[PDB]
Design a protein around this ligand. Structure first.
Ligand SMILES: [Zn+2]
Ligand SMILES: [Zn+2]
Ligand SMILES: [Zn+2]
Ligand SMILES: [Zn+2]
Ligand SMILES: [Zn+2]
Ligand SMILES: [Zn+2]
Lengths: 133, 133, 133
C-alpha cells in the first residue's frame, strides 16, 4: 500500500507517555494526553498530503454480572486494583470495590426516567443524576 | 424496576471533587475531570451488564439582558463570582465584571462575517475571532 | 451591526495564556484551556441574549509534500521548532525532525486494513494503529 486517503480512527496507542516524557512535556499536559483518542483525516494527491489530527476523550467499559466478583482496574479515575462485587438491594445496584481504600463503592437506581448514582469513598459521597437519551 | 438498559446523559454532579480527593487523585487529573459531562451506555441482559461511559467537555451558559447587572460565576475559567454589566457602545457589547480583578471585562462586536471578542483582565488582553457557520 | 444570532466557531485566539495568567488560573487548568477551540451559540432579538459556549479539543494541522523540507512548530506536544522532512522508503513515509532532540522522527505506513504510526524520540518509541472508516 502507498495511498492513505480516508479518515483513520485510532484503536491502539503504546508508550505515548514515554514518548512525551522524552520530549520533557510537562505532567499536566501528559495527564491530558493519556485520556485522549485520535482520528486523523488524510487526503493524498500524488506526493501531496493534507492531514488533520482530531481528539475526543477516551471511553471506558466496565462489564460484569451481578453477584460475580471481578477485578476492576480503575483507569479513568485513580488507577487502582479492586475486587468489585455488584448486588441487588431492592431495585438498587450496589457495588463494593474492596481494596486499598476503605468504604469504597457505589449505588445506582432508576426513578421515573432518571438514573441516580452515588459514588462513595471514605467520608466522601458524590451524587450524580442522568437523563435517558 | 431492575432494567437499566439505555443511554443516560448526566445533568447533575454534586461533590465530584470531594470523591476524587478522597481517592488521592492527582491535582491535574482532578482539574481535567470536573470540566466533563458524562453519558453512560448500559446494555443489560438480566444480570449481565456492559457499560461503556463517555465524556465530553461541559457546556457553559451565559444569559443576560443589556444594561441590567447579573451574577456571572466564572466557571470554565477562574471560578469567581462577579457582578457583570453589559452596555452598548454603538454596536459593541461592552461588559464590565466588577469583582476582584481590577480592570476585568470584555468587548464583543460583529464586523461582517466575523465576531470579535477582546477579553481583558488588568494589563492582559485576549483577542478571539469567530466565523459564523 | 446589532444582531449576533448564530453559531460562531473560533478561528484565532491570541494571548490566551496571558489572560489566564492575569486571572491566576492554576497551571493545570491553563494547560487544559490552551488546548481548546470554542463555539458560541448566540440567540438574541432585543437586548435579551442567550449564549451557550461549548469547547472541543483543537485540531492540529500538518501539510507537506514528500521531499520538501518544512518547519514544524510542535504545538500539540512540546512547543518546539523542528525542521521536518518526509521521504518515501518503499511504501513507508519516513519523516525526520531535525532539531534539539536527538533521534526525533516518525514512520507511517498502511498494512492493508490498517494504518501504522511510530513516533521516535531518543530510544523511546510510541506505536499507534488506526482503522479506516
Ligand atoms: Zn471533546
Ligand atoms: Zn453535569
Ligand atoms: Zn500540575
Ligand atoms: Zn482535558
Ligand atoms: Zn479535555
Ligand atoms: Zn477534552
Amino acid at each position: 500500500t502507498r495511498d492513505f486517503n480516508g479518515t483513520w480512527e485510532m484503536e491502539s496507542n503504546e508508550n505515548f507517555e514515554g514518548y512525551m516524557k522524552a520530549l520533557d512535556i510537562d505532567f499536566a499536559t501528559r495527564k491530558i494526553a493519556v485520556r485522549l483518542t485520535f482520528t486523523d483525516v488524510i487526503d493524498q494527491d500524488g506526493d501531496n498530503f493534507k492531514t488533520k489530527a482530531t481528539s475526543t476523550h477516551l471511553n471506558y467499559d466496565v462489564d460484569f454480572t451481578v453477584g460475580v466478583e471481578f477485578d476492576e482496574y480503575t483507569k479513568s479515575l485513580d488507577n487502582r486494583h479492586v475486587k468489585a462485587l455488584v448486588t441487588w438491594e431492592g431495585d438498587v445496584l450496589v457495588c463494593v470495590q474492596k481494596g486499598e481504600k476503605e468504604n469504597r463503592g457505589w449505588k445506582k437506581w432508576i426513578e421515573g426516567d432518571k438514573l441516580y448514582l452515588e459514588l462513595t469513598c471514605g467520608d466522601q459521597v458524590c451524587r450524580q443524576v442522568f437523563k435517558k437519551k
